Every structure is written in structure tokens, then in C-alpha cells.
Structure 1
Amino acid sequence: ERTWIFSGAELKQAIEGKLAPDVSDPEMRRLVSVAKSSAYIAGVADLTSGSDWCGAGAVAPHELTDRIYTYLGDMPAEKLDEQAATLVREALKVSFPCEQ
């Protein structure tokens, strides 16, 4: 019943530099791994900007990764097995809420 490309656990591993399994090079596993996490987060952040979270023009990419990493660190194993993107949306919404 898993159909998602990244789980929360895998996105957390990507941020930590651990999600380039098909890369044999060392000390360039890290570059590919964090490129995946940054780009996955960017997909969710770009799509949801101005709807689920606000202030895209005043937030640096590194700040998005930091908030998401903190949030994923808060999640128990059952939530981290679910799709990563919903967790990114939740992190952005609590971090950078839109005025209701």
C-alpha cells in the first residue's frame, strides 16, 4: 500500500547525506543526497506557497531544510513511514503560517 517515492524517514536520511544508495563515490554521496532533499522540499514548498505557508520571498532555502529537519526529528516511526511531502507541508504550515 506504499506508493510514495519518498517516505519521511527517507527524506530525513537525504538531509543527513545518507540517501544516495546508487552512488558508489564517497564524499559525493553527500552532495547527491542533500540535492535530493533540497529539491523534494522545493517541490512541495513551491507548490504550496501562498496557500499552506506564506513568506516565500523572505525565507532562504537553508531555513526550509532546517525547519523540515526539526519537524521530521519530532515524528514517530509510524508517521515517518508515510509520504514525506505531507510532512513537509505540515512543517511549512506550522513554521510559516498564512494569515487566516
Structure 2
Amino acid sequence: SIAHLTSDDVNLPGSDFFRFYRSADKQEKEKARIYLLGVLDATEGKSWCQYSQLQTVTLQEFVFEFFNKLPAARLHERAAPLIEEALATRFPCK
């Protein structure tokens, strides 16, 4: 596993992301939420829609719930596509 989240942690596994995402350290949790922000901005209006209709806390809640219900086997997948899947499947562009 990765100890703490840095900008060098490319190909970030779902398990590592999810650990930082839930961190009791507010700065660590914020860093994980910023990784999420990058993924959101990269995919919004393309695979899922959309900022005008969905608050950041809403996006954050649904991402958490997806990760929380994920079979342990899937946590080895990269964090970004998992996040994308979470939102694409619930909030498609129409």
C-alpha cells in the first residue's frame, strides 16, 4: 500500500484512494477529495452529467457509497475509472 497521498501516486489503486478519502486527517481527506476533483473535471459532461444538477457533497456521497459497497476484488482497479463508473451508472448524460 501507499503511506499517504502525493501527486506522484499515479495509477492510484481504489483501496489506497478509499483509505485516504476516509482519513481522519483533514488535510489527507482534502487531498483525496482533490484527486476526485481532477477525475470529476476530466469526466463531467462526458460520461456523467452534470455540475449544474449535482452538488460536490452529493458527488462525494455517491462516490463513497459506490466504494463502500464494492467487492474487495475490485479495489485493485485504478481509483479514477472506479469513480467514473460510480457516477456514469447513476447520473448518465441524456
Listed one character per residue, the Cα deviations across residues 43-95 of structure 1 (whole Å, up to 9, x for unaligned) are: 11111111100121222211111111100112122210111001000001012
Which ranges of 4 or more aligned residues in structure 1 deviate by more than 2 Å? Answer: none
> Do 1:4 and 1:83's aligned partners in 2 also have CA atoms closer than 8 Å?
no
Structure 2 residue runs of 5 or longer lacking an equivalent are 1-8
Structure 1 residue runs of 5 or longer lacking an equivalent are 19-29
TM-score (norm 2): 0.81
Pick closer, same or farther for the CA change 1:4–1:78 going to 2, 3 Å.
Answer: farther
Q: Distance in 2 between matches of 1:49 and 1:17?
A: 25
Q: Distance in 2 between matches of 1:11 and 1:61?
A: 17
What root-mean-square deviation, in Å, do the aligned CA atoms of Structure 1 and Structure 2 show? 1.7
> Do 1:17 and 1:31's aligned partners in 2 also have CA atoms closer than 8 Å?
yes
* Candidates 2, 12, 23, aligned match of 1:17: 23
Q: What are the equivalent positions in structure 2 for 1:76-87 lying under 5 Å apart?
A: 76-87=71-82
